[PDB]
Write an enzyme that holds these catalytic residues in place. Structure first.
Site, PDB file in Angstrom:
ATOM      1  N   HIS A   1       0.764  -1.284  -0.219  1.00  0.00           N
ATOM      2  CA  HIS A   1      -0.300  -0.088   0.190  1.00  0.00           C
ATOM      3  C   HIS A   1       0.943   1.010   0.067  1.00  0.00           C
ATOM      4  O   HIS A   1       1.957   1.446   0.703  1.00  0.00           O
ATOM      5  CB  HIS A   1      -0.582  -0.014   1.105  1.00  0.00           C
ATOM      6  CG  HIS A   1      -2.025   0.984   1.212  1.00  0.00           C
ATOM      7  ND1 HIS A   1      -1.367   2.089   1.138  1.00  0.00           N
ATOM      8  CD2 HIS A   1      -3.125   0.573   0.630  1.00  0.00           C
ATOM      9  CE1 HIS A   1      -2.782   2.773   1.481  1.00  0.00           C
ATOM     10  NE2 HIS A   1      -3.943   2.163   0.492  1.00  0.00           N
TER      11      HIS A   1
ATOM     12  N   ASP B   1       2.643  -4.430   8.180  1.00  0.00           N
ATOM     13  CA  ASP B   1       1.856  -3.739   7.634  1.00  0.00           C
ATOM     14  C   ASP B   1       0.423  -4.559   7.853  1.00  0.00           C
ATOM     15  O   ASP B   1       0.022  -5.067   7.083  1.00  0.00           O
ATOM     16  CB  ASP B   1       1.416  -3.256   6.579  1.00  0.00           C
ATOM     17  CG  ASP B   1       0.217  -2.093   6.129  1.00  0.00           C
ATOM     18  OD1 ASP B   1      -0.442  -2.392   6.858  1.00  0.00           O
ATOM     19  OD2 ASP B   1       0.375  -1.680   4.305  1.00  0.00           O
TER      20      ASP B   1
ATOM     21  N   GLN C   1      -4.848  -5.570   6.875  1.00  0.00           N
ATOM     22  CA  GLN C   1      -6.155  -6.178   5.836  1.00  0.00           C
ATOM     23  C   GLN C   1      -6.165  -6.972   7.001  1.00  0.00           C
ATOM     24  O   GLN C   1      -6.996  -7.991   6.524  1.00  0.00           O
ATOM     25  CB  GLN C   1      -5.113  -6.131   4.870  1.00  0.00           C
ATOM     26  CG  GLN C   1      -6.711  -6.444   4.159  1.00  0.00           C
ATOM     27  CD  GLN C   1      -7.388  -4.817   4.272  1.00  0.00           C
ATOM     28  OE1 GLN C   1      -8.733  -4.598   4.817  1.00  0.00           O
ATOM     29  NE2 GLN C   1      -6.977  -3.582   3.303  1.00  0.00           N
TER      30      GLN C   1
ATOM     31  N   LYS D   1     -11.572  -0.669   9.933  1.00  0.00           N
ATOM     32  CA  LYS D   1     -11.603  -2.191   9.267  1.00  0.00           C
ATOM     33  C   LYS D   1     -11.736  -3.432   9.777  1.00  0.00           C
ATOM     34  O   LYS D   1     -12.338  -4.027   8.936  1.00  0.00           O
ATOM     35  CB  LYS D   1     -10.444  -2.109   8.600  1.00  0.00           C
ATOM     36  CG  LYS D   1     -10.094  -1.105   6.964  1.00  0.00           C
ATOM     37  CD  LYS D   1      -8.139  -1.546   6.948  1.00  0.00           C
ATOM     38  CE  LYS D   1      -8.445  -0.461   5.523  1.00  0.00           C
ATOM     39  NZ  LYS D   1      -6.638  -0.793   6.014  1.00  0.00           N
TER      40      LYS D   1
ATOM     41  N   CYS E   1      -4.581   2.287  -4.103  1.00  0.00           N
ATOM     42  CA  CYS E   1      -3.970   3.243  -3.439  1.00  0.00           C
ATOM     43  C   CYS E   1      -2.688   2.316  -3.646  1.00  0.00           C
ATOM     44  O   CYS E   1      -1.979   2.144  -2.460  1.00  0.00           O
ATOM     45  CB  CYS E   1      -3.723   3.360  -2.055  1.00  0.00           C
ATOM     46  SG  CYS E   1      -5.351   4.981  -1.645  1.00  0.00           S
TER      47      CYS E   1
HETATM   48  C1  LIG Z   1      -2.837  -3.244   3.332  1.00  0.00           C
HETATM   49  C2  LIG Z   1      -3.109  -2.054   3.854  1.00  0.00           C
HETATM   50  N1  LIG Z   1      -2.190  -0.924   4.228  1.00  0.00           N
HETATM   51  C3  LIG Z   1      -2.774   0.181   4.582  1.00  0.00           C
HETATM   52  C4  LIG Z   1      -3.834   0.649   4.052  1.00  0.00           C
HETATM   53  C5  LIG Z   1      -3.878   2.037   4.516  1.00  0.00           C
HETATM   54  O1  LIG Z   1      -4.832   2.005   6.069  1.00  0.00           O
HETATM   55  P1  LIG Z   1      -5.297   3.805   6.635  1.00  0.00           P
HETATM   56  O2  LIG Z   1      -6.322   2.773   7.567  1.00  0.00           O
HETATM   57  O3  LIG Z   1      -6.802   4.414   5.274  1.00  0.00           O
HETATM   58  O4  LIG Z   1      -4.860   4.313   7.349  1.00  0.00           O
HETATM   59  C6  LIG Z   1      -4.340  -0.465   3.325  1.00  0.00           C
HETATM   60  C7  LIG Z   1      -6.355   0.811   3.611  1.00  0.00           C
HETATM   61  N2  LIG Z   1      -5.805   1.709   2.140  1.00  0.00           N
HETATM   62  C8  LIG Z   1      -7.575   0.983   1.826  1.00  0.00           C
HETATM   63  C9  LIG Z   1      -7.948   2.892   1.818  1.00  0.00           C
HETATM   64  S1  LIG Z   1      -7.098   3.731   0.424  1.00  0.00           S
HETATM   65  C10 LIG Z   1      -8.185   0.121   0.407  1.00  0.00           C
HETATM   66  O5  LIG Z   1      -9.534   0.383   0.341  1.00  0.00           O
HETATM   67  O6  LIG Z   1      -7.612  -1.254   0.588  1.00  0.00           O
HETATM   68  C11 LIG Z   1      -4.152  -0.714   3.412  1.00  0.00           C
HETATM   69  O7  LIG Z   1      -5.457  -1.781   2.333  1.00  0.00           O
END
Ligand SMILES: Cc1ncc(COP(=O)(O)O)c(CN[C@@H](CS)C(=O)O)c1O
Ligand SMILES: Cc1ncc(COP(=O)(O)O)c(CN[C@@H](CS)C(=O)O)c1O
Lengths: 405, 405
Positions: free
Chosen positions: B121, B198, B201, B224, B361
């Site tokens: 990401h 990270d 997910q 999430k 993203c």
């Molecule tokens: C593996 C992974 N790592 C980081 C993020 C972003 O984390 P945040 O909670 O947005 O700060 C995401 C989430 N990206 C979202 C919205 S951009 C998706 O729809 O996939 C992610 O999937």
């Protein structure tokens, strides 16, 4: 402004603590929320929760519309020119840290001066300490008058032609002082500096006008203006925010991402990395709707009424020291002769009265007052004169009890 | 695990969109919340909202107890040794940025290497880009297999003795890949590096064990995993977090504040400047209670059932490309031959089906797949096989319609 009608909107006020009715007098730490804000959060999580700017389905557009409409509500609330100058942050502390990391650490050479004051919250002190440590600049303080106010002459003498940043609070969380932000901004600009207003304590209780104040930055927290926790606002002049690198990096704030380099989005999203505080910002918009429905001038007048009443009632007690000026916001910071403030807060909580005791995250001011600790009772739009009566009566009873010990 | 009982707990699911029943398949962007979490937020704002660690009155101690109990719930949920290793942040993006600013930018000399992957990401890419730009280090990528997985041999060949940080995701938001985090941590430690997971997910859908994975850092987002927006968690090994300077400065995180220098608090409060996300963290604790009540293993099995079902049904459609491995998490990233993903998402929203279209993203991965855009349908604990049936039927209807154009 009928205050019974207002108190009926806050469900947390109608409870008892240790047998006594709740007398909440700690709004300078955090404020309570009306049914409008809580039910806004409820409606968001119940009806149209989705990620924003990320998938164009119906719930997604509803959530995006709510979030950006809250941003525009904030823009109107503080009279910003553009919502590109309105950035959603974690709070006042985070916004001040963002200005200190993205503006200060990038525009300070040795010989440059950063001037703050002796009454500043820790959030408006340590970021500047660390910035001048990282850049080798100089940190200077504006002295205070004997009544806890700032004179513009002391400002002019403290800020020189080598000053880059004047960092000052709008309202002091300890003294209740309302600082002359407008004239201070004029002074700072005359010496070629920018001005960063810590408006954490002013935004909930009085009308804000970035245009009239001509502040270069303004930081506010939502939990103090009847809004949800975890969200605040950074306002910066668009021309300044355009030349500032983002303090955070990730999705939503980029345009193109290569293997090694990326480009940023337009304002304001350049400064909002990751999934934003959606529900929190929409609830903050609800809080702004609520406040403007009551009227910020009405809230300010109620606050001044409560503060004058409290100052007079405190002067009716002997053996009590009150710190700060006469003209003030709705908070009274004090101590009792021969009683430590923590014991005062404890015995007041026994009576169901909620006050804060300690340094209030302002140790330099505490030493400036030559005190180690301190009690504080803060008022907001749901507090009555009867509650100040209860406070001063419990203070007299505490004095009588500790004298009898 | 009865899924009707679960769906009955999420009020947002029982509505209609553009005439059709809501089929929410965008949980990888954000998840929906059960009544437990929303009502936890309601109870907080209705009964014991107050600032934490700041004033010892009854509501203050109730709020502080709730906040720190949520911290301990998080510690138990991911099997951390101590809640000093559990830091509340704004989200996964903010936690990754904190590791990149406080660990990377302070422990990287030129010649040091930071290794990420092609599927990361943007939140796990740009912070490392900026860190190696600030330090003059080198950014390297671990190549991907043709099915979108990572082989440990490619890891060993990519991470050298000059590597300081391996930054890798636990589950890919695009590919659905579950990366071998444990063996990757072993490899990184053998070469003298730390590992940053990270886990944005993975945390919502599968059990996490910081001890078993031996990850040096782990980042997660609450929105999430059925929790409130605006809050997430950074986990760092206590020994590492002790030697890391705070990314933010202000109240709550200091011990002593002089005019020019300050000292920090113990973990974890050293990394939590200002008034924290109180209600958000307590709601995240409620979400953790809810998930553990259902059982993370049960949720993982439901996810694998949904994912295998979706892969088979997608293979029943011709003219559809699906990206990623067979063994995966509960998300399907795909494209239709001769139909752009944005149009797919639009016509699916016309049927009330909510999917995400775009780069998710992750632009480097998009170019790695030699695609510019992409559709994605993600599943969570409230999604049924009937909804996947609706999805594939609407996809077949979209194919038939665009072919007839
Ligand atoms: C593996 C992974 N790592 C980081 C993020 C972003 O984390 P945040 O909670 O947005 O700060 C995401 C989430 N990206 C979202 C919205 S951009 C998706 O729809 O996939 C992610 O999937
Ligand atoms: C003038 C001023 N500036 C900054 C802050 C801190 O902002 P945050 O919302 O906590 O991030 C505060 C609030 N300090 C709280 C809790 S430490 C008080 O009880 O006074 C403040 O009063």
């Amino acid at each position: 402004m009928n205050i019974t009608d207002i108190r009926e909107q806050f469900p947390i006020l109608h409870q008892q603590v240790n047998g006594h009715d709740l007398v909440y007098l700690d709004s300078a730490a955090t404020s309570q929320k009306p049914r409008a804000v809580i039910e806004t959060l409820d409606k968001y999580y119940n009806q149209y929760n989705s990620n924003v700017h990320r998938g164009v389905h119906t719930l997604g557009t509803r959530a995006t519309d709510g979030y950006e409409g809250a941003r525009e509500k904030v823009r109107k609330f503080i009279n910003a020119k553009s919502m590109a100058e309105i950035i959603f942050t974690k709070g006042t502390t985070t916004s001040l840290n963002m200005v200190a990391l993205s503006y200060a650490r990038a525009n300070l050479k040795p010989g440059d001066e950063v001037v703050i004051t002796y009454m500043e919250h820790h959030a408006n002190i340590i970021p500047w300490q660390q910035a001048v440590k990282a850049t080798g600049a100089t940190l200077k303080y504006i002295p205070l008058q004997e009544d806890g106010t700032i004179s513009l002459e002391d400002v002019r003498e403290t800020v020189t032609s080598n000053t880059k940043i004047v960092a000052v609070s709008h309202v002091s969380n300890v003294l209740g002082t309302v600082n002359p932000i407008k004239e201070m901004a004029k002074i700072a600009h005359d010496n070629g500096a920018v001005i960063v207003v810590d408006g954490a304590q002013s935004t909930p209780h009085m009308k804000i006008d970035v245009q009239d104040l001509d502040c270069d930055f303004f930081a506010l927290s939502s939990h103090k203006m009847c809004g949800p926790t975890g969200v605040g606002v950074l306002y910066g002049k668009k021309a300044l925010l355009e030349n500032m690198e983002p303090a955070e990096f990730g999705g939503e704030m980029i345009d193109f991402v290569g293997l090694y380099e990326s480009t940023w989005k337009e304002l304001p999203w350049k400064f909002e990395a990751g999934t934003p505080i959606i529900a929190g910002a929409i609830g903050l918009g609800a809080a702004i709707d609520f406040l403007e429905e009551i009227g910020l001038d009405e809230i300010s007048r109620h606050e001044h009424k409560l503060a004058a009443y409290a100052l007079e009632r405190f002067r009716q007690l002997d053996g009590v020291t009150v710190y700060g000026p006469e003209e003030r916001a709705g908070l009274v910071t004090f101590n009792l002769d021969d009683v430590h403030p923590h014991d005062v807060a404890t015995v007041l909580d026994a009576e169901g009265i909620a006050v804060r005791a300690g340094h209030h995250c302002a140790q330099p001011l505490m030493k400036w007052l030559d005190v180690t600790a301190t009690a504080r009772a803060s008022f907001y739009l749901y507090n009555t004169e009867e509650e100040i009566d209860k406070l001063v009566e419990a203070l007299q009873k505490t004095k009588e009890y500790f004298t009898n010990v």
